[PDB]
C-alpha cells in the first residue's frame with residue numbers, strides 16, 4: 347500500500363492524532379499501570395493478527411464518511427476485513443455457491459438494477475457479494491468452508507439487473523478471547539454486528555461502491571459495534587408463498 | 603501487566619480516544635489509500651517490535667505528566683524502553699562498568715545527595731543509572747557490549763550521597779529504517795534525542811522517581827523527539843584540571 351500524502355499533511359495529521367491521544371491521557375489521568383496494560387495490548391493486537399479487525403471495526407467508518415462526501419450514488423459503508431478479490435463469476439440470475447447445509451436456511455432472493463445517476467441502467471455491471479453463513483462464518487476465514495462459499499461476482503445483464511438467491515446471514519460476533527474482544531469485554535460492550543451483506547458494485551466508466559445491507563428488525567441493528575449501519579441500507583424483505591424472502595435493491599453508481 | 607481500571611473508566615477513555623482519532627480523520631479528510639498505509643504501518647510497528655519505542659517516544663511523556671501532579675520531589679521524566687532491573691550494585695563512590703574504549707571518553711563525575719522533602723539525607727538509598735555509550739548504544743540492546751556496560755545500582759552511604767564516575771552519553775538516534783523512523787522521515791522530522799542519563803532513585807519508605815538528566819548546550823536539547831526534556835533536568839558540568847567534567851545533582855524523594 348502507498349499513498350501520495352506530503353510530509354506536511356502527514357506532520358499535521360500526526361500532530362493532531364498524537365496531541366489528541368496525549369490530551370486524553372491528561373484528561374483521564376491515565377496511570378503507569380494503565381499505560382503498561384495499553385502497551386501490552388497493542389503488542390497482543392499485532393501478535394494475534396487483529397490490526398485489520400480492530401481498525402475496520404473502530405476506525406474505518408470515519409474513512410467511509412470522508413469518502414461519502416464526494417459521492418451522490420447509493421450510500422457506501424465499510425469494506426470490513428473479509429473481502430476477497432476475483433470471486434467466481436455467476437450469471438445475472440444465479441444462486442451463490444453454498445453447501446447443502448446452507449441450503450436448509452430460508453432462501454433470500456435479492457433483485458435489482460445497477461443504474462447511473464440520472465437513472466439509466468448499465469451493461470457489464472458487476473455485483474461482488476460476500477457474506478457470512480448461518481453459523482456466522484466467512485469462507486477463507488473458516489477452514490471447513492469451500493473457499494467461495496456465499497461469495498460471487500454477479501454479471502448484471504444488458505439492462506443492469508440481477509437476481510441473486512442466497513441466504514440471510516447470521517449476525518457476526520468478534521471473538522471474545524482476542525485482544526479486540528478483550529478490549530470490548532473490559533468496557534462492558536457488545537461484540538456484535540447485525541446480519542449484513544457486503545457488496546462491491548462496479549460498471550464500465552464508473553466509480554465502484556463498497557457497501558453493506560442490513561435487515562429490518564434484525565438484532566444489533568441499533569448497536570453495531572462497527573458504527574457502520576445506515577438507515578438507507580436496511581432491507582425489508584417480504585416473504586413469498588414458496589416461503590422465500592424477497593427483496594429488491596437498486597445500486598446507483600457515480601462516474602469515475 | 604494488570605491495572606484496576608473499571609469497565610466505566612475504560613469505556614470513557616476508549617470513547618474519547620477513538621472519538622478523537624475519528625475526529626482527526628474527518629478533519630483532515632483521510633483517504634482510503636492513506637488508511638491502507640496506516641493499517642500496514644501499525645502491522646509493521648508490531649512486526650518490528652517497536653511498540654515500546656513508539657509509545658515511549660510519542661505517548662509516555664503525557665503519562666509522566668499525569669504522575670508529576672502528585673509529586674513534590676525532583677522532576678521525573680519518562681523511563682523510555684531500555685531500562686533493565688537488578689543492575690549490579692556498586693559503592694557510594696564508584697565508576698560504572700565500562701570497556702577500555704569507553705575509558706577514552708572524557709570522564710563525567712556525578713555527585714550528589716539523596717534527601718527527603720524537608721532536606722534530610724537518606725540511608726540505604728539506591729541510584730539506578732543507565733545510559734548509552736559514545737556510539738549511542740545501550741548494553742542488552744547491542745550484542746557487542748558487556749551486559750551491564752554503563753549500568754549500575756549505586757548504594758548511597760549513610761548520609762544519602764554518591765560519587766559516580768562515568769562518561770557523557772552521545773545523543774540517541776531512532777533507527778531510520780524501522781517503522782518509527784519511517785514515520786518520522788515521512789513527515790520531515792528529526793529522529794534524535796539529546797544526550798541523557800536515565801536514573802531511578804529509591805530509598806526505604808520512599809516513592810521512587812524515574813527521571814532523565816540532560817547537558818546544557820548539547821544538541822537536540824531544544825527538540826527532543828520524545829518531548830521528555832525539562833529545564834530543571836539540564837546539567838551544567840564544570841571541567842576540572844584533570845580535564846574531567848564535574849556535576850553535582852541532588853535527588854529529593856516523596857514518601858511512599
Ligand SMILES: Oc1cc(Cl)cc(Cl)c1O
Pocket residue numbers: 399402403424425426427428518520539572574
Ligand atoms: O464481518 C465483519 C467482521 C468484523 Cl470484525 C468487522 C466488520 Cl465491519 C465485518 O463486516
Ligand SMILES: Oc1cc(Cl)cc(Cl)c1O
Pocket residue numbers: 655658659680681682683684774776795828830
Ligand atoms: O534511549 C531512548 C530511546 C528511545 Cl527510542 C526513546 C527514549 Cl525516551 C529513550 O530514552
Ligand SMILES: [Fe+3]
Pocket residue numbers: 426428478518542544
Ligand atoms: Fe462482515
Ligand SMILES: [Fe+3]
Pocket residue numbers: 682684734774798800
Ligand atoms: Fe535513553
